[PDB]
Amino acid sequence: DDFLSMLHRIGESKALVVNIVDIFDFNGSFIPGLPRFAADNPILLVGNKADLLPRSVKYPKLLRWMRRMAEELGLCPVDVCLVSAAKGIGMAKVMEAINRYREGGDVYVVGCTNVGKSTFINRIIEEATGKGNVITTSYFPGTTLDMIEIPLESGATLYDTPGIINHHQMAHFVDARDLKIITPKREIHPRVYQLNEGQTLFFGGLARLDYIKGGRRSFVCYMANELTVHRTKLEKADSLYANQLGELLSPPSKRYAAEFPPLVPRSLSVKERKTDIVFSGLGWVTCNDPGAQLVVHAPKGVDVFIRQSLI
């Protein structure tokens, strides 16, 4: 309930809210309680990890997709930015945007864990320090909640809010060791798979895609290249998953195959051309033709859905 008092207090201020989310796991970056408490606050939506994006991705598409993805969740951002907190790409633009939309007031940086908030905030801390400012760590009116105060010119202050607010993203179902693998080191390379009806693709042991009906088709997989992919006929998919989970089908490692949540199936009918079958926290597979009939599996809570291709 400390996060609530915090969310309520920043709501009173009417100050600019910088909400940073992971573009590969937007659903796992949503903060249900944000627009409920921040209706009057102008919010800047920042999509981190843009450096892992395949060069074939068109920014305007992603831009419009995330605004639309946010719009759908009661969250109506004043603007949207794409940055790579790790590579410093797009950081200059996001700073100009922050100075513009805050006008003269403060700014609160909000976001769930594993989104890149600390890396993003570290770049600001480094710049502010180079300008002679003093950065302070203290308590946001709650207690357990640590906050970082970063002085902006003339009285105003940028505040880093508890990076916490963990939720139900793919990252939380994987232990530290295998999370490294799910996490890409560099830009994502396409992997083309020509599938026939009655075939299945396992992405590690984390998610599954069944090609139910539709004729020979090319699926282009866009996920962490360390993530091993396995293909088998639909009719043996369940038997394989029961015996190879933790072994051939990993992550998850055999260690915590007694933690791994059941994969929940969902039916999907691809009616439009050039679409992305999005697997939250993992990436997506692109179907360049319509008609596809599929069944997708992923842990409960992690969203799998289709959108107009970003490619």
Ligand X SMILES: Nc1nc2c(ncn2[C@@H]2O[C@H](COP(=O)(O)OP(=O)(O)O)[C@@H](O)[C@H]2O)c(=O)[nH]1
CB 301 to ligand X: min, Å = 18
CA distance 99 to 130: 18
The burial class, CB within 10 Å (0-12 / 13-18 / 19+), for 291 is middle
CB 194 to ligand X: min, Å = 30
Helix, strand, or coil (residue 206): coil
By the rule CB under 6 A, 252 interacts with ligand X:
no
List the one residue from 73, 78, 86, 156 that touches ligand X (CB under 6 A): 86
Near ligand X by CB under 6 A, which window of 46-54, 72-80, 142-150, 278-286? 46-54
The interface with ligand X within residues 141-170 (CB under 6 A) comprises: 163
Q: 22 a known binding residue?
A: no
Helix, strand, or coil (residue 276): strand
List the one residue from 18, 85, 150, 306 that touches ligand X (CB under 6 A): 85
Please report, for residues 28, 121, 148, 179, the alpha-carbon distance to residue 145 in angstroms, rounded to integers and kept in the order given.
Answer: 21, 16, 10, 26
Q: 116 a known binding residue?
A: yes
Q: 85 a known binding residue?
A: yes
By the rule CB under 6 A, 29 interacts with ligand X:
no
For residue 211, which phi and psi values (nearest 5 degrees)? -90, 100
CB 192 to ligand X: min, Å = 23
List the one residue from 115, 221, 223, 268 that touches ligand X (CB under 6 A): 115
> CB-wise, 84 or 199, nearer to ligand X?
84
Element counts in the chain: helices (H) and strands (E): 7, 17
Residues contacting residue 137 through CB under 8 Å, at least 6 positions apart: 146, 147, 148, 149
What's the token pair of residue 263? 């994969």
CA distance 54 to 285: 12
Q: 192 a known binding residue?
A: no
Nearest-5° angle of CA 23, CA 311, CA 297?
60
For residue 295, which phi and psi values (nearest 5 degrees)? -130, 120
List the one residue from 52, 249, 277, 287 that touches ligand X (CB under 6 A): 52
CB 114 to ligand X: min, Å = 5
- Name the strands in the sheet holding 79-82, side by side, starting at the edge strand that comes first in the sequence: 79-82, 43-48, 16-22, 107-110, 157-160, 146-151, 136-139
What's the token pair of residue 92? 């200059």
Q: Report the 10 Å Cβ neighbour count for 82.
A: 20
- Which residue type, as a one-letter code, is found at position 224? A
> CB-wise, 167 or 307, nearer to ligand X?
167
By the rule CB under 6 A, 113 interacts with ligand X:
yes
> CB-wise, 99 or 119, nearer to ligand X?
119
List the one residue from 29, 41, 48, 169 that touches ligand X (CB under 6 A): 48
The H or E element that residue 51 is part of is none
List the one residue from 29, 53, 82, 117 that touches ligand X (CB under 6 A): 117
> CB-wise, 51 or 175, nearer to ligand X?
51
Near ligand X by CB under 6 A, which window of 83-91, 99-107, 193-201, 226-234? 83-91
Q: Which residues bind ligand X (CB under 6 A)?
A: 48-49, 51-52, 84-86, 113-119, 163
Binding-site residue numbers for GDP are 48, 51, 85-86, 114-119
Binding-site residue numbers are 48, 51, 85-86, 114-119
